[PDB]
Ligand binder design. Structure first.
Ligand SMILES: O=C(O)c1ccc(C(=O)NCCO)cc1
Length: 257
């Protein structure tokens, strides 16, 4: 694997708030962002290993970038360029959120600080609440995205037959805002049966789980990004088969990948 980055993984390594790569940050202003409300980019200083796949992350309704700020450094430390985006408006809907994510990854192709540190062919999308719905729309409008991860996703749309990108759907058990039955689960089973996919329910968690460091959320997001953005077969061990939980009330996948 030429995109393999970093030492072989451990259940501790993927659970670390910061992984191996030391990371730096650039702030995109609301003014210098075409199609989004700006954002904060996280990237590994180490270019010795090669270029890094990109990931865009959106917040949810009414929420600023702070909602999802913990995820940018935590994923980029493992070998990725991550943009934590603030929406054009706090009342932005999931479909716009899908546009603002393609806009944010596109911006990464021209950002001066991270143009040479990125691999423009291997990209992925992620979002919390409506942010997760966005992540789902950008995948359906682009069959080149290498991965997609909805987190307590919220959306009006449920059919996801078009989706052709490896998708990890994440739900919280006690969610009263975006119920799993009407959303997350509804999105996984609408996805292509033959694609590479997985659904994971988190135990005891409310809808606001992704708005605070959650180790279960981070480790599996980092394993999906590694298996599909870096084609890393070293991280398939953390997804196939299902793992011990305590935090996972439910899991279903299309293993083996
Ligand atoms: O899609 C959302 O995230 C969302 C869903 C329902 C509410 C709500 O119950 N509020 C109604 C009056 O404000 C808020 C946000």
């Amino acid at each position: 694997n030429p995109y393999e980055r970093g030492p072989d993984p451990t259940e501790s390594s993927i659970e670390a708030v910061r992984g191996p790569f030391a990371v730096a940050q650039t702030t995109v202003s609301r003014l210098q962002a075409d199609g989004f409300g700006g954002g904060t980019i996280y990237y590994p200083t180490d270019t010795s290993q090669g270029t890094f796949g990109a990931v865009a992350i959106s917040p949810g309704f009414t929420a600023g970038q702070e909602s999802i700020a913990w995820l940018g450094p935590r994923i980029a430390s493992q070998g990725f360029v991550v943009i934590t985006i603030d929406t054009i408006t706090r009342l932005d809907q999931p479909d716009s959120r899908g546009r603002q994510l393609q806009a944010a990854l596109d911006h990464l192709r021209t950002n001066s600080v991270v143009r040479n540190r990125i691999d423009p062919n291997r990209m992925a999308v992620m979002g919390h609440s409506m942010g997760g719905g966005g992540a789902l729309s950008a995948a359906a409008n682009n069959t080149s995205l290498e991965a997609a991860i909805p987190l307590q996703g919220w959306h009006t749309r449920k059919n996801w037959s078009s989706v052709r990108t490896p998708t990890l759907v994440v739900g919280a058990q006690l969610d009263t805002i975006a119920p799993v039955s009407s959303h997350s689960e509804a999105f996984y089973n609408s996805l292509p049966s033959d694609l590479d996919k997985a659904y994971m329910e988190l135990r005891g968690a409310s809808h606001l789980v992704s708005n605070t460091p959650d180790t279960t959320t981070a480790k599996y997001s980092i394993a999906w990004l590694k298996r599909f953005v870096d084609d890393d077969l070293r991280y398939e061990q953390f997804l196939c088969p299902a793992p011990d939980d305590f935090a996972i009330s439910e899991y279903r996948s299309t293993c083996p990948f």
